[PDB]
Amino acid sequence: VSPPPPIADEPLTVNTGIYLIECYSLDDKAETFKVNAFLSLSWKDRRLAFDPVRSGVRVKTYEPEAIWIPEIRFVNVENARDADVVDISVSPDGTVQYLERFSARVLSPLDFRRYPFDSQTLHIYLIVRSVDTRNIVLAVDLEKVGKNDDVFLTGWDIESFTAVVKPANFALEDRLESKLDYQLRISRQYFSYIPNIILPMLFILFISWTAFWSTSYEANVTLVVSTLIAHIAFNILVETNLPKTPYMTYTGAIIFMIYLFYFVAVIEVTVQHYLKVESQPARAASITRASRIAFPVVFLLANIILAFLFFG
Amino acid sequence: VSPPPPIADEPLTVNTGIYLIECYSLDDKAETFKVNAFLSLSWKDRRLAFDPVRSGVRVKTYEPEAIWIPEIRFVNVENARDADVVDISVSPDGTVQYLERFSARVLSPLDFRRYPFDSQTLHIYLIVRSVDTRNIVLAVDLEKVGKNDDVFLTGWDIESFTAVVKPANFALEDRLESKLDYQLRISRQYFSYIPNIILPMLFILFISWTAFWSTSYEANVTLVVSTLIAHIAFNILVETNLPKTPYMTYTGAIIFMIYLFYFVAVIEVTVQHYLKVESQPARAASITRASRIAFPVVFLLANIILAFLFFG
Amino acid sequence: VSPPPPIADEPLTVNTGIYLIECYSLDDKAETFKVNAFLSLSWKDRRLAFDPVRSGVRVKTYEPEAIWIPEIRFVNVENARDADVVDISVSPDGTVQYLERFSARVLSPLDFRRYPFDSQTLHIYLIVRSVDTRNIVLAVDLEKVGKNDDVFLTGWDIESFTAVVKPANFALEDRLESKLDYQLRISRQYFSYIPNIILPMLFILFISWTAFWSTSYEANVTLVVSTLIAHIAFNILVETNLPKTPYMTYTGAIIFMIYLFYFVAVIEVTVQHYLKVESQPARAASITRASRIAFPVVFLLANIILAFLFFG
Amino acid sequence: VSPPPPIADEPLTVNTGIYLIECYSLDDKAETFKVNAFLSLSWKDRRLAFDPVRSGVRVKTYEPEAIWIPEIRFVNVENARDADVVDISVSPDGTVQYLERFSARVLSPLDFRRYPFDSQTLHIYLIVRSVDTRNIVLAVDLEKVGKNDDVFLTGWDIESFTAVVKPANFALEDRLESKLDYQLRISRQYFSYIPNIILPMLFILFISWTAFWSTSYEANVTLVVSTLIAHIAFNILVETNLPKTPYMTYTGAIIFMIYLFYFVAVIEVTVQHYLKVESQPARAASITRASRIAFPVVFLLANIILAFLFFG
Amino acid sequence: VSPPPPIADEPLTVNTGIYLIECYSLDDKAETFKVNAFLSLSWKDRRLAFDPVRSGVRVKTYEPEAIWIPEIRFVNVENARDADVVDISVSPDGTVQYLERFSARVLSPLDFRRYPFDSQTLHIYLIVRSVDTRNIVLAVDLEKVGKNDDVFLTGWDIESFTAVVKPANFALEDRLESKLDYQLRISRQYFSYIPNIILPMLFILFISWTAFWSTSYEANVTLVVSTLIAHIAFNILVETNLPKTPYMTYTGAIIFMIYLFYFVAVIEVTVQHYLKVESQPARAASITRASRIAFPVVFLLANIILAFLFFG
Ligand SMILES: [Cl-]
Ligand SMILES: [Cl-]
Ligand SMILES: [Cl-]
Ligand SMILES: [Cl-]
Ligand SMILES: [Cl-]
């Protein structure tokens, strides 16, 4: 029909609330996730008021095509939501209760500066456009905001799901808008990365470092170059999960430092052999004896400094 | 139309049953499977009752748009089911029979603690929301629960398909709900993993262990490091099927233990060569003679202990 | 409208036939293929009969919404077919001709026991459910079963497309059903597997076997271990096409036998070097001279026995 | 309505034409491409004729649901086209002009005998089925066949887009059909394959051939076996683009010849070392001196013969 | 209804404007991106004019099915846009305001000559077809062209979004068209390619170059051939992102030059060993001493020349 007339030019208030039923398919590369939830609306149309004692009923049921329903839209979705109407009810005073169940695909940026040990906030924006004869604003009904106890995200820990009460009001396309923000806080589960990636890589590194207790040039070359090939295959497996970012990240810095260490170890081996050939064995012995202690300490200090820089 | 009036404020009972026709596309990473089944409903509307001897017919056929049909929904599906109506029939006493065929995509968590030798239970939840003038509850009709003899899941053995008779009743969004649980028990087929993964890996391990019967440092390095590269490529192939979990699993523990063994073998080779160079051949001979027996026994004991810890 | 009345309680017969237009997207992992075909129906409604000489026309054309059309369904499809109606015509005696063009996705198990040289049969099932006032049965019209001369499946040779004349009658959900089976026989094209997989692998095997004409331990280790790495990469490429089965297959047995051969060759090399070091050169010479002949003959006999076991 | 009546039992002619707007997503494995084009129809209905000077208009506009429009279908598409109607106009004499814009997915076989330097023809078939009271035939209107100047296929050069004027008439399902063929000729862009695949492979081959200027058995084994591993990784990368064919192809023959060359080079190395050990150095020197020239000449002659066999 | 009548045979002008809300899924291989935006239209229908003081309202609201709306289409989209109507309003003078929100998939070529450091322009074309009784032309309304502050493309920097004011007028299918061009300028974020690809490759190159400070033929072969295997795996990882082009590109030229360098280094090693064996040590010493300086300088000069050729 037509939007409800004002009595003294007041804004119409619409009370919202979202109840989460499902959450799945969080994609890091595309920065998307799928949702399945309820949507609840409530407003007041004085034209719908009835007498209870006369009609003999306290509650009225309507079809969606018989009354005026405001148009509420999601802002950061790919296509329009797929929704069906659950129930419409009207109170004797005039207030109408609206409920529907929908599904949608949401777009939301992510931060990867602490990739294996990070936390993300996901947003859902709701907007409504005013009409030429009425002003509409949004409100939050805290009795209708929640989630199911069975909601699970594969690889994440859900912490909270709250709304910002204050809406943002502005002008878009020569018309006034009102916007609402729903937030969902999550935490990555990082247990499996330790014995899957971290410890095997340290094992390969320590296996490469055994070249400082040997004096055979050929076995030293084999050791180092083959451990480097294995490092490359590990890096290639790891880089498939992380997308490209315009800022430096923890894992990338670690990987670059590992390459740098392999380079310096090759240089040390080559210098040792060169000095040996040139009949200067004492100098090569002292250099390898120094390197034996120097490499792990500098590795440990580099790692401590990096962890303080990124997480402190 | 309108929900059937109560006679003395009693709850309306709706008898359900699901007959499985197809089951396919079980995805471990996304924890989803597709289904194709029948759905059967039965209730009583006294307003539909007729006389058999008068009309001259015992059974009445209606369209779906001519009578009141309760709204039944699936809880853990991605989008609403695609369904068509097969037949609607009404009995002379008032009972109506409903049948439809649907397709849907279901979400269900999985446990991977015994990944190659595990068993899964899959759930399907059915819910119905009460109306403002009547209370609706769900019941199970055991004469209409079953599956086809041609249902096949690629890589799984189907065991049973039963329902829990007792429904769960609660309040959601200031309205009463009733929920039903259907369970499907399956078992992985694990025959192919043995000669495909398990035995070749043991072959590579035993091939790496031949370095305790040799005294050549270069061939020992080649042997061990190349077998380690092959182990890495096997692990990389295997890790594509298992998703990330927040708990320890059998396969991951085995793989970590294999890396640990390779590390210790490199250390043994290096110690042997170092003692040989230093003119202490008896000590190196005794160490390699000890290691020859020590490695397989400790492997076997570790494996027995792990298998008792995970399956016992 | 309503199903055609019986004259003396006889079953209504419906004559079917499928004409294939397209066949594509045969997926081995998912055991599915896509189809595009005609569907032809024919039955008799005495209520439609007219006089030819009166109306002045011999053939009558109807819309699909103006007459009763039986409901025919496909049993092993994922979702309901997408179909449109081509023509409906009625004969003066009462017989009606029905034609439509559809598309669907079909599910059908496959056998992989002779994977590179196998043959498959694909099934399509058609079912019809009886109504409360009439019994319906299915028949096959052999004048309307065929395929186009341009039907092509990428990698397969189509042999025949026939129907089983006798239908299967049973009771489902307290109602009678009738089912029909359409079969399509195909054969894999195996020419490309020979110079793509088989011969290169034999080349690598023969290249590994050159270690019995050498007495250098390091080159022998390099030869064998590197050929084994190449075998692993070939196996990893091959295993992507075959899905997991619960029975043994020809290719898997060949691959396991190849691993076993590599293991035994490593053992032979190690024994040879060990005996040489221990100052027993005659025994090592005799062992390598024996192995030179022993390996290819045992390979050939194993292969003959396996081929007789699987194909004989 | 109803198909236009004949005057003296003549066939109705329908003039067609396709104007290409877009062409994208050419898939070699699945032998499919997507299209976006116009479709133009023209015929004569004497029942639509009007007087221009009376009505005061020269052109009449109708809705698609108000007149009879022939049913035109595409033969080698996966699903029915998605189309919308652009304009319908009628001439005072009776001729009607029809225009629509559609999108579709087309199936078309490809030939790969000259894979990097091949040319393909793509077909689009149009069919129409006669009715029980009229015969319909197809014609080509050369003033309405063309393509846009912005049509681009990623990796192909478009040459021409023409139609065969003569239609093919036959009987299908006891009814007459008429079929039309549209052809689109393309050519692969082969510039990038040279410095991406061809030249690096020749570099690896020439690097393997340096073993004829050396007398060290271990470095010769390392050289050859490692170059063979690199050849295998190149072949594995290349084989992902080409599908399986039942005939021999140029690239596959080249790859098989490369494997054969590696085999023969390993044999040469082994024979050389064997003769050296046996105290026959002159014979090994002469054999390696012969091989130095023999290998590249036989490679070049083999390549010339293959190129003449496939392209001549 | 019917298009608005001209007063003195003038063209109808339609004022357009696009406001960007979302931009995502830029695919390099397929040259596509997804968009979500507003669309604004404005024209004048004298038949809609009313009196404000009489009706007592200044603004009129219509349904989309009650008035004539011009047909506007996108030219380089895959399928027709998914759109819904937001508001329709009419001014007392006769001007009508139109707004809608749509989603579409756009096709647009890309240039890769400076792949890691390139900039792209993306186009969106709008067309309208004239009718048989009126001429329609397009105009640009600069007060309705813009984008949101939250628009983000994963891996790109958005610079501007403007329109070309002058439309292109021509004749298509014997009817006049008008076309408009919207442009969107972007820039790749290239920070992550440096420590991810560029520097590790230089490390491997410098590690291969250590063979000019050694006189052991076997370690030199191991060094060079293994670094070449690592280069091949890096190239294989990199080539998955770039599609095939018919012109030369910066990255491909760099990669080819790296292969050429590896070839020449193998040749140098082989010549050195050959001269050493032949008892000419001074000549081999001088050659390796020359190569030590010659290789990096020629690399640096080649790189400078290439960078000037492609970016200067
Ligand atoms: Cl929405
Ligand atoms: Cl549902
Ligand atoms: Cl169906
Ligand atoms: Cl079509
Ligand atoms: Cl459009």
E289 Cα distance to chain centroid = 48
Strand-strand pairing, E32-44 and E12-27: antiparallel
DSSP 3-state assignment of E263? helix
Minimal C-alpha gap between B219 and chain C (Å): 6
Measured in Å, residue D36 CA sits from the centre of ligand 5 at 12
Strand-strand pairing, D175-188 and E136-140: unpaired
**Would you put residue E56 in left (φ > 0), alpha (ψ -120 to 50) or beta?**
left
Strand-strand pairing, D156-163 and E82-90: unpaired
Cβ(C171)–Cβ(C177) below 8 Å: yes
Looking at residue A115, what DSSP letter applies? G
- Taking an 8 Å cut-off on Cβ atoms, the answer to whether A222 and E223 are in contact is no
* Cα B275 from Cα B215, distance rounded (Å): 12
Alpha-carbon distances, residue D171 vs A214, C215, D72, D75 (angstroms): 86, 77, 16, 15
Cβ(C232)–Cβ(C17) below 8 Å: no
Cβ(E76)–Cβ(E106) below 8 Å: yes
* Cα A231 from Cα A244, distance rounded (Å): 20
**Alpha helices (runs of H) in B34-176, residue ranges in sequence order:** 52-55
Measured in Å, residue B98 CA sits from the centre of ligand 2 at 16
In terms of Cα–Cα distance, which of A206, D2, A231 is closest to E204? A231
- Dig out the tokens for D307 from the structure: 């190129």
* Cα B202 from Cα B258, distance rounded (Å): 10
* Cα B17 from Cα B15, distance rounded (Å): 7
C76 Cα distance to chain centroid = 14
DSSP 3-state assignment of E152? coil
Specify the amino acid at residue A9. Answer: D
* Cα A129 from Cα A142, distance rounded (Å): 23
- Taking an 8 Å cut-off on Cβ atoms, the answer to whether C229 and B234 are in contact is no
What φ, ψ does residue E264 adopt, rounded to 5°? -65, -30
Kindly report the three-state secondary structure assignment for every residue of C32-94: EEEEEEEEEEEEECHHHCCCHHHHCCCCEECCCCCCCCCCEEECCECCCCEEEEEEEEECCCC
Instruction: Dihedral sign for Cα C224, C226, C229, C233, please.
Output: negative
Q: Which residues pair with E33 in a beta bridge?
A: E106
Which chain A positions have a beta carbon within 8 Å of B270's beta carbon?
A: 210, 213-214
Which chain E positions have a beta carbon within 8 Å of D219's beta carbon?
A: 217-218, 221
- Taking an 8 Å cut-off on Cβ atoms, the answer to whether B228 and A223 are in contact is no
**Would you put residue D217 in left (φ > 0), alpha (ψ -120 to 50) or beta?**
alpha
Element housing E183 (H / E): strand E175-188
* Cα B91 from Cα B297, distance rounded (Å): 75
What φ, ψ does residue C19 adopt, rounded to 5°? -115, 120
- Dig out the tokens for A234 from the structure: 């590990």
Cβ(B200)–Cβ(B231) below 8 Å: no
Measured in Å, residue B305 CA sits from the centre of ligand 5 at 66
Q: Which residues pair with B179 in a beta bridge?
A: B127, B168
Q: How was this structure determined?
A: cryo-EM
Strand-strand pairing, D60-61 and D82-90: antiparallel
- Taking an 8 Å cut-off on Cβ atoms, the answer to whether E230 and A228 are in contact is yes
Minimal C-alpha gap between B149 and chain C (Å): 13
**Alpha helices (runs of H) in chain B, residue ranges in sequence order:** 52-55, 193, 199-208, 217-238, 250-277, 281-311
Closest CB to B19: pick one of C133, C173, C277.
Answer: C173
Closest CB to E173: pick one of D38, D82, D199.
Answer: D38
| Interacting residues of D29 by C-beta distance below 8 A, sequence separation 6+ | C154, D243
Taken in order of first residue, the domains within chain B and their CATH numbers are 12-188 (2.70.170.10), 193-311 (1.20.58.390)
In terms of Cα–Cα distance, which of D80, D105, D88, D102 is closest to D41? D88
**Alpha helices (runs of H) in A5-139, residue ranges in sequence order:** 52-55
DSSP 3-state assignment of A203? helix
| Interacting residues of C121 by C-beta distance below 8 A, sequence separation 6+ | C183, C184, C185, C186
Cβ(D22)–Cβ(D35) below 8 Å: yes
Which residue is it, tokens 């799984």?
A: B156
Which chain C positions have a beta carbon within 8 Å of B219's beta carbon?
A: 217-218, 221
Which residue is it, tokens 């937001």?
A: E86
> How many C×D Cβ pairs under 8 Å?
104
Polymer length of chain C:
312
Cβ(A20)–Cβ(A149) below 8 Å: no
Closest CB to B230: pick one of C29, C232, C270.
Answer: C232
Which chain B positions have a beta carbon within 8 Å of A239's beta carbon?
A: none
